[PDB]
PDB file of all heavy atoms in Angstrom:
ATOM      1  N   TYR A 124      15.752  18.714  25.060  1.00 51.28           N
ATOM      2  CA  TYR A 124      17.181  18.995  24.873  1.00 51.28           C
ATOM      3  C   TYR A 124      17.613  20.320  25.490  1.00 51.28           C
ATOM      4  O   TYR A 124      18.776  20.467  25.859  1.00 51.28           O
ATOM      5  CB  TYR A 124      17.546  18.983  23.386  1.00 51.28           C
ATOM      6  CG  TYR A 124      17.191  17.678  22.741  1.00 51.28           C
ATOM      7  CD1 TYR A 124      15.937  17.485  22.184  1.00 51.28           C
ATOM      8  CD2 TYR A 124      18.090  16.624  22.729  1.00 51.28           C
ATOM      9  CE1 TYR A 124      15.580  16.281  21.620  1.00 51.28           C
ATOM     10  CE2 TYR A 124      17.748  15.406  22.159  1.00 51.28           C
ATOM     11  CZ  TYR A 124      16.490  15.246  21.607  1.00 51.28           C
ATOM     12  OH  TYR A 124      16.131  14.043  21.034  1.00 51.28           O
ATOM     13  N   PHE A 134      21.633  21.418  26.207  1.00 56.95           N
ATOM     14  CA  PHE A 134      21.797  22.519  25.257  1.00 56.95           C
ATOM     15  C   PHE A 134      21.160  23.801  25.759  1.00 56.95           C
ATOM     16  O   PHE A 134      20.068  23.783  26.315  1.00 56.95           O
ATOM     17  CB  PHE A 134      21.187  22.151  23.898  1.00 56.95           C
ATOM     18  CG  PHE A 134      21.834  20.965  23.237  1.00 56.95           C
ATOM     19  CD1 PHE A 134      21.413  19.675  23.530  1.00 56.95           C
ATOM     20  CD2 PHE A 134      22.856  21.138  22.315  1.00 56.95           C
ATOM     21  CE1 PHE A 134      22.014  18.574  22.932  1.00 56.95           C
ATOM     22  CE2 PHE A 134      23.458  20.048  21.711  1.00 56.95           C
ATOM     23  CZ  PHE A 134      23.033  18.761  22.020  1.00 56.95           C
ATOM     24  N   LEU A 139      21.509  26.082  20.113  1.00 57.84           N
ATOM     25  CA  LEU A 139      20.602  25.598  19.081  1.00 57.84           C
ATOM     26  C   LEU A 139      20.452  26.610  17.950  1.00 57.84           C
ATOM     27  O   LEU A 139      20.473  26.241  16.776  1.00 57.84           O
ATOM     28  CB  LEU A 139      19.235  25.260  19.677  1.00 57.84           C
ATOM     29  CG  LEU A 139      19.178  24.093  20.664  1.00 57.84           C
ATOM     30  CD1 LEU A 139      17.733  23.736  20.953  1.00 57.84           C
ATOM     31  CD2 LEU A 139      19.936  22.879  20.142  1.00 57.84           C
ATOM     32  N   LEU A 142      23.372  26.376  15.660  1.00 57.81           N
ATOM     33  CA  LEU A 142      23.298  25.141  14.886  1.00 57.81           C
ATOM     34  C   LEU A 142      22.388  25.351  13.671  1.00 57.81           C
ATOM     35  O   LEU A 142      22.752  25.009  12.541  1.00 57.81           O
ATOM     36  CB  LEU A 142      22.789  23.993  15.770  1.00 57.81           C
ATOM     37  CG  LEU A 142      22.744  22.549  15.253  1.00 57.81           C
ATOM     38  CD1 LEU A 142      22.746  21.575  16.422  1.00 57.81           C
ATOM     39  CD2 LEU A 142      21.523  22.301  14.392  1.00 57.81           C
ATOM     40  N   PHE A 157      29.313  17.804  11.728  1.00 58.32           N
ATOM     41  CA  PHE A 157      28.377  17.279  12.715  1.00 58.32           C
ATOM     42  C   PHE A 157      28.452  15.765  12.839  1.00 58.32           C
ATOM     43  O   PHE A 157      28.399  15.221  13.943  1.00 58.32           O
ATOM     44  CB  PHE A 157      26.953  17.685  12.347  1.00 58.32           C
ATOM     45  CG  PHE A 157      25.921  17.236  13.337  1.00 58.32           C
ATOM     46  CD1 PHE A 157      25.825  17.843  14.581  1.00 58.32           C
ATOM     47  CD2 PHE A 157      25.044  16.210  13.019  1.00 58.32           C
ATOM     48  CE1 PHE A 157      24.872  17.433  15.493  1.00 58.32           C
ATOM     49  CE2 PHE A 157      24.082  15.800  13.921  1.00 58.32           C
ATOM     50  CZ  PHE A 157      24.000  16.411  15.160  1.00 58.32           C
ATOM     51  N   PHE A 194      14.661  19.420  18.116  1.00 49.46           N
ATOM     52  CA  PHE A 194      15.587  19.888  19.143  1.00 49.46           C
ATOM     53  C   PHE A 194      14.888  20.860  20.091  1.00 49.46           C
ATOM     54  O   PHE A 194      15.383  21.149  21.179  1.00 49.46           O
ATOM     55  CB  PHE A 194      16.871  20.486  18.524  1.00 49.46           C
ATOM     56  CG  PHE A 194      17.589  19.560  17.543  1.00 49.46           C
ATOM     57  CD1 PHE A 194      18.689  20.017  16.830  1.00 49.46           C
ATOM     58  CD2 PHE A 194      17.170  18.248  17.336  1.00 49.46           C
ATOM     59  CE1 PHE A 194      19.351  19.187  15.927  1.00 49.46           C
ATOM     60  CE2 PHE A 194      17.823  17.413  16.432  1.00 49.46           C
ATOM     61  CZ  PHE A 194      18.913  17.886  15.728  1.00 49.46           C
ATOM     62  N   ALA A 219      24.122  14.392  22.471  1.00 51.50           N
ATOM     63  CA  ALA A 219      22.814  15.032  22.601  1.00 51.50           C
ATOM     64  C   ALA A 219      22.034  14.577  23.834  1.00 51.50           C
ATOM     65  O   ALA A 219      20.913  15.049  24.064  1.00 51.50           O
ATOM     66  CB  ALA A 219      21.994  14.770  21.357  1.00 51.50           C
ATOM     67  N   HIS A 246      25.873   8.715  19.608  1.00 47.14           N
ATOM     68  CA  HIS A 246      24.422   8.850  19.562  1.00 47.14           C
ATOM     69  C   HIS A 246      23.744   7.757  18.735  1.00 47.14           C
ATOM     70  O   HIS A 246      22.527   7.564  18.828  1.00 47.14           O
ATOM     71  CB  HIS A 246      24.055  10.224  18.995  1.00 47.14           C
ATOM     72  CG  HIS A 246      22.609  10.562  19.155  1.00 47.14           C
ATOM     73  ND1 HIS A 246      22.019  10.733  20.389  1.00 47.14           N
ATOM     74  CD2 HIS A 246      21.624  10.722  18.240  1.00 47.14           C
ATOM     75  CE1 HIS A 246      20.735  11.002  20.226  1.00 47.14           C
ATOM     76  NE2 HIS A 246      20.472  11.006  18.933  1.00 47.14           N
TER      77      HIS A 246
HETATM   78  C1  KKN B 301      18.864  14.625  18.857  1.00 37.80           C
HETATM   79  C2  KKN B 301      20.021  15.472  18.432  1.00 37.80           C
HETATM   80  C3  KKN B 301      20.316  16.818  18.854  1.00 37.80           C
HETATM   81  C4  KKN B 301      19.588  17.668  19.770  1.00 37.80           C
HETATM   82  C5  KKN B 301      20.116  19.023  20.029  1.00 37.80           C
HETATM   83  O1  KKN B 301      21.322  19.490  19.391  1.00 37.80           O
HETATM   84  C6  KKN B 301      22.043  18.644  18.481  1.00 37.80           C
HETATM   85  C7  KKN B 301      21.499  17.265  18.221  1.00 37.80           C
HETATM   86  O2  KKN B 301      22.061  16.256  17.346  1.00 37.80           O
HETATM   87  C8  KKN B 301      21.089  15.120  17.503  1.00 37.80           C
HETATM   88  O3  KKN B 301      21.223  14.062  16.910  1.00 37.80           O
END
Side-chain angles (χ1 to χ4, degrees):
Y124 303 89
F134 298 86
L139 294 190
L142 186 158
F157 182 72
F194 306 174
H246 191 65

